[PDB]
Design an enzyme around this catalytic site. Structure first.
Site, PDB file in Angstrom:
ATOM      1  N   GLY A 277       0.824  -1.225   0.000  1.00  0.00           N
ATOM      2  CA  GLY A 277       0.000   0.000   0.000  1.00  0.00           C
ATOM      3  C   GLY A 277       0.852   1.266   0.000  1.00  0.00           C
ATOM      4  O   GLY A 277       2.073   1.160   0.250  1.00  0.00           O
TER       5      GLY A 277
ATOM      6  N   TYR B  38       1.324   8.429   4.973  1.00  0.00           N
ATOM      7  CA  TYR B  38       2.181   7.741   5.979  1.00  0.00           C
ATOM      8  C   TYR B  38       3.488   7.255   5.327  1.00  0.00           C
ATOM      9  O   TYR B  38       4.519   7.138   6.047  1.00  0.00           O
ATOM     10  CB  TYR B  38       1.392   6.603   6.641  1.00  0.00           C
ATOM     11  CG  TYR B  38       0.847   5.565   5.690  1.00  0.00           C
ATOM     12  CD1 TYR B  38       1.659   4.538   5.226  1.00  0.00           C
ATOM     13  CD2 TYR B  38      -0.471   5.606   5.247  1.00  0.00           C
ATOM     14  CE1 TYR B  38       1.183   3.582   4.344  1.00  0.00           C
ATOM     15  CE2 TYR B  38      -0.963   4.658   4.362  1.00  0.00           C
ATOM     16  CZ  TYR B  38      -0.131   3.644   3.908  1.00  0.00           C
ATOM     17  OH  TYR B  38      -0.580   2.688   3.042  1.00  0.00           O
ATOM     18  N   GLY B  39       3.453   6.982   4.014  1.00  0.00           N
ATOM     19  CA  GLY B  39       4.603   6.492   3.225  1.00  0.00           C
ATOM     20  C   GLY B  39       4.236   5.276   2.392  1.00  0.00           C
ATOM     21  O   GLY B  39       3.108   4.781   2.505  1.00  0.00           O
TER      22      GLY B  39
ATOM     23  N   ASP C 167      -5.660   4.735  16.964  1.00  0.00           N
ATOM     24  CA  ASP C 167      -5.944   4.546  15.516  1.00  0.00           C
ATOM     25  C   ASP C 167      -6.309   3.085  15.234  1.00  0.00           C
ATOM     26  O   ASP C 167      -5.806   2.553  14.240  1.00  0.00           O
ATOM     27  CB  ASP C 167      -4.773   5.045  14.664  1.00  0.00           C
ATOM     28  CG  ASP C 167      -5.131   5.426  13.231  1.00  0.00           C
ATOM     29  OD1 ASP C 167      -4.199   5.400  12.382  1.00  0.00           O
ATOM     30  OD2 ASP C 167      -6.334   5.768  12.969  1.00  0.00           O
TER      31      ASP C 167
HETATM   32  C1  LIG Z   1      -2.706   1.761   7.099  1.00  0.00           C
HETATM   33  N1  LIG Z   1      -1.419   1.465   7.745  1.00  0.00           N
HETATM   34  C2  LIG Z   1      -0.333   1.841   6.834  1.00  0.00           C
HETATM   35  C3  LIG Z   1       1.023   1.487   7.438  1.00  0.00           C
HETATM   36  C4  LIG Z   1       1.063  -0.025   7.677  1.00  0.00           C
HETATM   37  N2  LIG Z   1       2.373  -0.526   8.134  1.00  0.00           N
HETATM   38  C5  LIG Z   1       3.387   0.366   8.704  1.00  0.00           C
HETATM   39  C6  LIG Z   1       3.092   0.550  10.160  1.00  0.00           C
HETATM   40  O1  LIG Z   1       2.346  -0.340  10.836  1.00  0.00           O
HETATM   41  O2  LIG Z   1       3.543   1.521  10.699  1.00  0.00           O
HETATM   42  C7  LIG Z   1       2.636  -1.873   8.025  1.00  0.00           C
HETATM   43  C8  LIG Z   1       3.568  -2.490   8.883  1.00  0.00           C
HETATM   44  C9  LIG Z   1       3.814  -3.823   8.762  1.00  0.00           C
HETATM   45  C10 LIG Z   1       3.108  -4.544   7.786  1.00  0.00           C
HETATM   46  C11 LIG Z   1       3.298  -5.910   7.619  1.00  0.00           C
HETATM   47  N3  LIG Z   1       2.615  -6.565   6.714  1.00  0.00           N
HETATM   48  C12 LIG Z   1       1.736  -6.001   5.897  1.00  0.00           C
HETATM   49  N4  LIG Z   1       1.110  -6.880   5.002  1.00  0.00           N
HETATM   50  C13 LIG Z   1       0.006  -6.555   4.191  1.00  0.00           C
HETATM   51  C14 LIG Z   1      -1.036  -5.729   4.598  1.00  0.00           C
HETATM   52  C15 LIG Z   1      -2.071  -5.433   3.735  1.00  0.00           C
HETATM   53  C16 LIG Z   1      -2.102  -5.967   2.452  1.00  0.00           C
HETATM   54  N5  LIG Z   1      -3.162  -5.663   1.569  1.00  0.00           N
HETATM   55  C17 LIG Z   1      -4.386  -5.150   1.869  1.00  0.00           C
HETATM   56  C18 LIG Z   1      -5.086  -5.009   0.722  1.00  0.00           C
HETATM   57  C19 LIG Z   1      -4.264  -5.436  -0.324  1.00  0.00           C
HETATM   58  C20 LIG Z   1      -4.612  -5.484  -1.786  1.00  0.00           C
HETATM   59  O3  LIG Z   1      -4.544  -6.864  -2.170  1.00  0.00           O
HETATM   60  N6  LIG Z   1      -3.123  -5.826   0.180  1.00  0.00           N
HETATM   61  C21 LIG Z   1      -1.067  -6.804   2.047  1.00  0.00           C
HETATM   62  C22 LIG Z   1      -0.028  -7.091   2.913  1.00  0.00           C
HETATM   63  F1  LIG Z   1       0.988  -7.889   2.538  1.00  0.00           F
HETATM   64  C23 LIG Z   1       1.495  -4.633   5.976  1.00  0.00           C
HETATM   65  C24 LIG Z   1       2.179  -3.874   6.945  1.00  0.00           C
HETATM   66  N7  LIG Z   1       1.989  -2.558   7.098  1.00  0.00           N
HETATM   67  C25 LIG Z   1      -0.002  -0.318   8.728  1.00  0.00           C
HETATM   68  C26 LIG Z   1      -1.368   0.048   8.148  1.00  0.00           C
END
Ligand SMILES: CN1CCC(N(CC(=O)O)c2ccc3cnc(Nc4ccc(-n5ccc(CO)n5)cc4F)cc3n2)CC1
Lengths: 148, 290
Positions: B10, B14-15, B125
């Site tokens: 994504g 936030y980045g 959040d």
């Molecule tokens: C909104 N906010 C944005 C920042 C995000 N973030 C940085 C943080 O926490 O500070 C992380 C941190 C670790 C993460 C580990 N794993 C994932 N995995 C994953 C999460 C979703 C999807 N995904 C959802 C919909 C789709 C379309 O098919 N894909 C596919 C994936 F592989 C995300 C992480 N994010 C947390 C959420």
């Protein structure tokens, strides 16, 4: 228990710590901190000023562990103090986000961020403890007032 | 250099977040890339706070921050990699969960949340996108961008915290101070999503609509239930909605036990909101529960 009073201690603290700086005033730290809080306020990055008794005690808690006895210039001391400040805002400030420009006094931005990472790696644990442990907060509040 | 990008997960304010591989160890991580080169936007500010908090929050139900790299004009936070979020899970399964998965996810959420609160951290959040889900059924609380430490006496926090649909009534009424109770309301909202079709319980357009939608279901609190309500800064009189409106049609996946936990999480008056610790002792989580 006044902000000015607690800022005057911090400045007198920094002057005693930083023996090598002969032409530094205990008002210089105070001027640098107030100047930043004003800038952010007048640019509309906050509604109220960040510099209150509690946050001055927090900033002190960082400074006494981050600021070497051996800082060589007033310019380096300001760079380091404002790095500690930027981290106080980002940890305790009521705004989601705060900009860099007010806090940056180095031509090398790489240096500023490397230092942020340094202080978080040293202090992240006491940054939580001063909030979790009221005893520790009072210990540090006391120590600040005993710096005049 | 140390990490090979595989695909973007994504991107927002936030980045950008990539799936990635360690070049040395070949282990699959998640990278959040935070740009530092814009010196008049405070995105870094939030990133550094997220780093300070996750360095002191190690628990199998909180996303693990492995390392932080400063290289180029970027910060790179190295997270453990997760399969999806709860948002894409609801989409994935027609919003229609097994009552045991519902029970499993809420449990893991309250463990990670009770850990945060015990360590004196507010999340502020909670929403499906910040709940990371693995294939083995593991759930992690993620995104500590808006989280803050508490304990030092303050005039107030920010009221501009928690996305509208998950914000508790005290905060909608502009409460100066709030406690760990803030995350316990969000937990209630998420629980109701799990227990129906993954659809938001209180999807309001503004603050007014939000408070109307909550009181319409739960009933407008009385001076007996919530004395200080009418003294809150952004308080204005709402209709007296009855406290008799059934919860059965709103969460049809839950037995009376599930529904009793939901009502303890969604008390308007923050003081009466069940804690993560208290919630985990609830009959809904016994091996006895039907
Ligand atoms: C909104 N906010 C944005 C920042 C995000 N973030 C940085 C943080 O926490 O500070 C992380 C941190 C670790 C993460 C580990 N794993 C994932 N995995 C994953 C999460 C979703 C999807 N995904 C959802 C919909 C789709 C379309 O098919 N894909 C596919 C994936 F592989 C995300 C992480 N994010 C947390 C959420």
């Amino acid at each position: 228990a006044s902000t000015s009073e607690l800022l005057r201690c911090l400045g007198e603290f920094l002057c005693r710590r930083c023996y090598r700086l002969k032409h530094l005033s205990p008002t210089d730290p105070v001027l640098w901190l107030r100047s930043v809080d004003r800038s952010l306020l007048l640019q509309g990055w906050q509604d109220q000023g960040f510099i209150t008794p509690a946050n001055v005690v927090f900033l002190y808690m960082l400074c006494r562990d981050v600021i070497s006895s051996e800082v060589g210039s007033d310019h380096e001391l300001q760079a380091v103090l404002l790095t500690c400040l930027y981290l106080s805002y980002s940890y305790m400030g009521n705004e989601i986000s705060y900009p860099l420009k007010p806090f940056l006094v180095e031509s090398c931005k790489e240096a500023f961020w490397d230092r942020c990472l340094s202080v978080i790696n040293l202090m992240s644990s006491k940054m939580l403890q001063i909030n979790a442990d009221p005893h520790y907060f009072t210990q540090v509040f006391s120590d600040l007032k005993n710096e005049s | 250099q140390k990490y090979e990008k595989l695909e973007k997960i994504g991107e927002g304010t936030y980045g950008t977040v990539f799936k990635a591989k360690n070049r040395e160890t070949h282990e699959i991580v998640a990278l959040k890339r935070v740009r530092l080169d814009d010196d008049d936007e405070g995105v870094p500010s939030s990133a550094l706070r997220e780093i300070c908090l996750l360095k002191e929050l190690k628990h199998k139900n909180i996303v693990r921050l492995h390392d932080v790299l400063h290289s180029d004009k970027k910060l790179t936070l190295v997270f453990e990699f997760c399969d999806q979020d709860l948002k894409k899970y609801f989409d994935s399964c027609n919003g229609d969960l097994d009552p045991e998965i519902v029970k499993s996810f809420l449990f893991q959420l309250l463990k990670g949340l009770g850990f945060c609160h015990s360590r004196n951290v507010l999340h502020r959040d909670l929403k499906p996108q910040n709940l990371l889900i693995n294939r083995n059924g593991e759930l992690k609380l993620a995104d500590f961008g808006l989280a803050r430490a508490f304990g030092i006496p303050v005039r107030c926090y920010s009221a501009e915290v928690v996305t509208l649909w998950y914000r508790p009534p005290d905060v909608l009424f502009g409460a100066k101070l709030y406690s760990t109770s803030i995350d316990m309301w969000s937990a209630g909202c998420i629980f109701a999503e799990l227990a129906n079709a993954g659809r938001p319980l209180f999807p309001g357009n503004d603050v007014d609509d939000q408070l109307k939608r909550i009181f319409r279901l739960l009933g407008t609190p009385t001076e007996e239930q919530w004395p200080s309500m009418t003294k809150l800064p952004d308080y204005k009189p709402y209709p007296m909605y009855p406290a008799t409106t059934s919860l059965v049609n709103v969460v049809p996946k839950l037995n009376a036990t599930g529904r009793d936990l939901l009502q303890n999480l969604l008390k308007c008056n923050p003081v009466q909101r069940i804690s993560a610790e208290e919630a985990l002792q609830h009959p809904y989580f016994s091996d006895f529960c039907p």
